[PDB]
């Protein structure tokens, strides 16, 4: 179902609506594109523009609040646009960070219309969209050099999300009505280089599963069982993948690992009966 040459500039992200019927591509050309996919067809609708620097990542909001797609660019700003009347418009612009923003994912509709922003400005922001338009932002420093990922943890307070460091550190953050904002929990060390990406699973089974990919060219699957329980570092393999590792994605169900390399190859992984990993 290829959509050959969607952009002019190299593409940095390919995400779909909750109903895999409409896509969203973003590139360096500072532009994002909306799509329609059927059997093998690709209808190109609008092309989102207002981004000064290369767009990095984008994320589809839950249909619960209509059609909304958020994008983050080098321009140190993340922007969201809705699709009222089949015509794409820019609803709000979030630019609190001072430097590139490399990741932006939406919170489980349960939580609400929340967006988690992680900038290379070393900080991270949490923003929910009220009514009138003016939101109440929440920012908290998260890493030394910077921040590269900010995946969320499923619903359960009890609001958690993992961060990937520019300083090689993976962290866990849980809300706190007494602290007024998300505070640190874990600080799982493991990578020798920078944490390129970290995604948290929705697999509600007995134990929690977290993925961490990095310039150190390895994935460390962080498995923990309960509050007490510490996270068990686990090398996806006791060798190095020839190139870096940029993305890690969790399948809806069946909990399978989508590990987008850098050697330009995508690999899939599963945890056999023991607790190790194998292809698919």
Residue numbers in the entry: 2 to 157, 169 to 292
Q: Any passages from the paper?
A:
In eukaryotic cells, newly synthesized proteins are transported from the endoplasmic reticulum (ER) to the Golgi apparatus through the action of the coat protein complex II (COPII). Sar1 recruits heterodimers of Sec23 and Sec24 to the membrane, thereby forming the inner layer of the COPII coat. Sec23/24 is an adaptor complex: Sec24 binds transport cargo while Sec23 interacts with Sar1 and recruits Sec13/31. Sec13/31 heterotetramers constitute the outer coat layer, thought to polymerise into cages that enclose the budding membrane.
We incubated giant unilamellar vesicles (GUVs) with yeast COPII proteins (Sec12, Sar1, Sec23/24, Sec13/31) in the presence of a non-hydrolysable GTP analogue GMP-PNP. To understand the architecture of the Sec13/31 outer coat we applied reference free, contrast-transfer function (CTF) corrected, subtomogram averaging to solve the 3D structure of the vertex, and of the connecting rods to resolutions of ∼40 Å (and ‘Materials and methods’). The connecting rods are consistent in shape and size with Sec13/31 heterotetramers, and are bent in the middle by approximately 15°. This same bend is seen in the solved X-ray crystal structure, which can be fitted into the densities as a rigid body. In contrast, there is a 45° bend in the rods of in vitro-assembled protein cages. When we analysed the distribution of vertices and rods on the tubular membranes we found that they assembled regions of rhomboidal lattice.
